[PDB]
């Protein structure tokens, strides 16, 4: 007979002890552990709600990979690269580059908790977390590898995190802040609760359904399979938050949640907002990016936070306003400076798409539409010089994304600037400046791409010079219009 897990599980996490040969702080230094002075004894109250064990893990995960890899192998000749909409191919390129090596980086966030968390249950679940993210990194390298021989932009599935390309710096500055660059408890809160539970879960579910609609059943199956692993390790932040709250650290808990959600939002808006509202074929859109955020991200956060005895972040009003505006400007910028992206952005501004945009965002045409009118006219007149940039955008010293606002008839743009230790910083929002001010030592000496350009680190001081610095190796790699401006013919 076998004894059921509940009968022996507690012994798997009875692993805390009172150090005698080194001090508790030596074994769990605050900078790596993040225990906020809460004594070891108290951490023993940490309880991960969804339990599992080693033999169950290797068994189920073996089956998952058997499925994932077999599906890929069976569809090898389905000519996905050649037959998909160019918008879908750019979605894949953008996803693999922004995510694959970040997933692998997440092994380190999990590892941080496995060694340095004072909670025994956290140390064990983090061990499965290391394994899960290893799986995810390896899958998301192996899968795109197939396309390298077809298209140099798929090289970026590996290359992006090794580059100084703008979006890669935006990704790394965020992920290094919430995954690899902070103590164990900050990881639990910022990565597992805020980012994984709060964004990626719903994002991955939506992406897998989008892949199926695109006829990419290999990717659909991949993304679905990966998402089934999420709860196993994403569950770790909830119990950590409860513990901080019980031990008089609610204020610090709230502040860490507030920081992570906003930082995740800005990155999410530049990389996924344009995909939903502009890259996805019109006939396949069932919600706007605003609808997705409002109905699948925001309310879920509010309910989960309340459930934990936390509150909506102070900036919630700003967040709701941002969802109407931000990603429309971000998309315009990604497209106008497309040559600096490793994927090909779709303009998404045929009259039919513009009518949808207007329906989903009243006032769109007298705002962003005003800029697209000029762009469109230049395209029709073959003025390729006027749809290619000759300068750098100004860039946020937190998000590493350009400083944007509302264009056209309702022009409004605001930079939030700071003089700190003799240096002038610029931020794209009141929240981004506040994040910087919460932990200046994390950020203060970091140089964004513009800072580097102005410090003489990028030569020659030309577009070609910037592209070289950003890691591009051929003309094919540089982003172009997804449809080679075919949309203009409908204008």
């Amino acid at each position: 007979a076998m004894h059921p897990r509940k009968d022996w599980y507690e012994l798997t996490r009875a692993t805390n002890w009172t150090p005698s040969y080194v001090t508790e702080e030596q074994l769990f230094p605050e900078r790596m552990s993040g225990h906020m002075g809460i004594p070891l004894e108290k951490w023993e109250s940490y309880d991960e709600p969804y339990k599992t064990s080693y033999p169950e893990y290797v068994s189920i995960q073996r089956e998952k990979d058997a499925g994932a890899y077999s599906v890929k192998a069976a569809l090898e000749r389905a000519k996905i690269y050649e037959n998909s909409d160019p918008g879908w191919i750019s979605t894949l390129k953008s996803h693999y580059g922004a995510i694959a090596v970040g997933e692998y980086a997440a092994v380190t966030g999990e590892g941080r908790m496995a060694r340095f968390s004072k909670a025994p249950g956290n140390r064990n679940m983090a061990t499965f977390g290391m394994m899960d993210e290893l799986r995810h990194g390896q899958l998301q390298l192996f899968f795109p590898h197939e396309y390298c021989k077809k298209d140099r932009q798929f090289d970026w599935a590996w290359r992006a995190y090794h580059s100084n390309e703008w979006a890669a710096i935006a990704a790394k500055h965020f992920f290094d802040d919430i995954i690899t660059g902070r103590d164990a408890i900050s990881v639990a809160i910022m990565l597992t609760f805020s980012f994984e539970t709060g964004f990626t879960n719903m994002q991955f579910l939506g992406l897998a359904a989008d892949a199926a609609e695109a006829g990419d059943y290999t990717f659909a199956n991949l993304i679905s399979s990966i998402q089934t692993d999420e709860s196993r390790h994403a569950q770790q932040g909830g119990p950590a938050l409860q513990l901080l709250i019980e031990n008089g650290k609610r204020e610090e808990a709230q502040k860490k949640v507030d920081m992570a959600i906003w930082r995740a939002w800005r990155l999410f808006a530049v990389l996924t907002g344009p995909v939903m509202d502009y890259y996805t074929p019109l006939e396949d859109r069932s919600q706007s990016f605003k609808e997705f955020m409002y109905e699948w991200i925001i309310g879920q956060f509010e309910r989960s936070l309340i459930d934990l005895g936390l509150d909506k972040p102070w900036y919630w009003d700003l967040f709701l306003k941002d969802i109407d505006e931000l990603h429309h400007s971000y998309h315009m910028g990604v497209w106008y400076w497309r040559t600096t992206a490793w994927w090909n952005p779709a303009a998404g501004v045929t009259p039919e798409e513009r009518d949808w945009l207007e329906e989903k965002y009243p006032g769109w045409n007298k705002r962003w539409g005003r800029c697209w009118d000029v762009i469109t006219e230049n395209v029709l007149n073959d003025r390729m010089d006027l749809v290619s940039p000759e300068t750098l955008p100004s860039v946020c010293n937190m998000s590493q994304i350009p400083l944007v606002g509302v264009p056209g008839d309702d022009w409004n743009i605001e930079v939030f600037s700071l003089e700190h230790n003799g240096r002038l910083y610029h931020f794209g929002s009141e929240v981004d400046r506040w994040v910087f001010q919460q932990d200046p030592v994390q950020y203060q000496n970091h140089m964004n791409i513009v800072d580097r350009f102005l410090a003489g680190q990028i030569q020659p001081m030309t577009l070609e010079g910037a592209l070289k610095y950003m890691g591009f190796q051929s003309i094919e790699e540089m982003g172009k219009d997804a449809h080679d401006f075919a949309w203009a013919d409908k204008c």
Binding site: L11, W17, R62, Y69, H145, C148, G181, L467, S474
Partner: protein, 306 residues
């Protein structure tokens, strides 16, 4: 200056030396972007706390090599192949547990063996969890993704052994409810003389934050001592006391332990490409061995008492 170029058949970093690399190379090689910039491992202020940590404890390690990323796991394991292998081993162990239970094996061990198990076996959960914590530390600090991957799998294996031990402590308690099984392990780990060499060893090893010293102390000193002075003597005592299950369980765990030794030996061979590393590694082994020797000696006196 930008020209037209053909697609590459594999990753640009491998595309000069290969056309179609192994699955292992495709998914494992050159993934620590954090080693690219010596002033800012992580994309943050160059002097952020974690950047300072990594510059000191990884980049500035006296164990020095200009090509850590070229290290290769001699088994070339990936996540997929590890789970295939370990699901097989867990089918083996779980079937052993089931069958020995059905026979009431535990009832038939020699008089007193339950007290030896309670004293010398069940508190191993603390030792194994320490190995788990330590392996995860080498993982996060190692200067190549191929090294870190070996550490991830070693961390998982350490949890595997911790899990076997939890399961068996509980099971054994069902036959011997008055032996303190599942109740006294923490107090033994903290207070019993036979555990104090091992506890001092691990508390100190877990505060060796230099990645190289962490790797050498863990994989070249601690873990081989545990094989020689804990696992093997426990195995012998078990047979002597009519416990047939323990020795078989330990042989499965020793297969993991031998694998850890294999990749560790391979990393040593890679490091020794820089002859300066010989003195560094030997220096750290000589530094840690006496502590491991005291730990072994104390444990063995306890195991063999009465």
């Amino acid at each position: 200056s930008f020209e037209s170029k053909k697609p590459m058949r594999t990753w640009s970093h491998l595309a000069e030396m290969r056309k179609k690399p192994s699955e292992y190379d495709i998914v494992s090689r050159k993934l620590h972007y954090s080693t690219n910039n010596p002033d800012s491992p992580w994309e943050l202020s160059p002097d952020s706390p974690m950047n300072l940590w990594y510059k000191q404890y990884r980049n500035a390690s006296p164990l020095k090599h200009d090509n850590w990323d070229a290290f290769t796991d001699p088994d070339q394991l990936v996540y997929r192949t590890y789970n295939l292998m370990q699901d097989g081993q867990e089918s083996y162990v779980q079937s052993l547990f089931d069958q020995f239970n059905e026979r009431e094996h535990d009832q038939m061990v020699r008089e007193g063996w339950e007290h030896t198990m309670a004293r010398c076996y069940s508190p191993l959960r603390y030792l194994f969890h320490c190995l788990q914590m330590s392996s995860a530390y080498v993982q996060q600090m190692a200067p190549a993704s191929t090294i870190s991957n070996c550490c991830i799998l070693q961390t998982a294996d350490s949890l595997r052994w911790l899990t076997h031990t939890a399961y068996r402590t509980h099971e054994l308690s069902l036959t011997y409810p008055d032996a303190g099984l599942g109740e006294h392990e923490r107090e033994l780990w903290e207070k019993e003389p036979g555990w104090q060499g091992l506890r001092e060893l691990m508390e100190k090893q877990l505060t060796a934050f230099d990645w190289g010293e962490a790797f050498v102390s863990l994989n070249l000193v601690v873990k081989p001592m545990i094989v020689e002075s804990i696992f093997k003597p426990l195995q012998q005592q078990a047979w002597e006391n009519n416990d047939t299950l323990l020795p078989l369980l330990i042989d499965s765990q020793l297969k993991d332990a031998e694998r850890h030794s294999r990749w560790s030996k391979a990393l040593v061979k890679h490091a020794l490409e820089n002859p300066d590393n010989h003195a560094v590694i030997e220096g750290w082994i000589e530094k840690w061995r006496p502590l491991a020797d005291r730990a072994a000696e104390a444990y063995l006196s306890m195991l063999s008492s009465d």
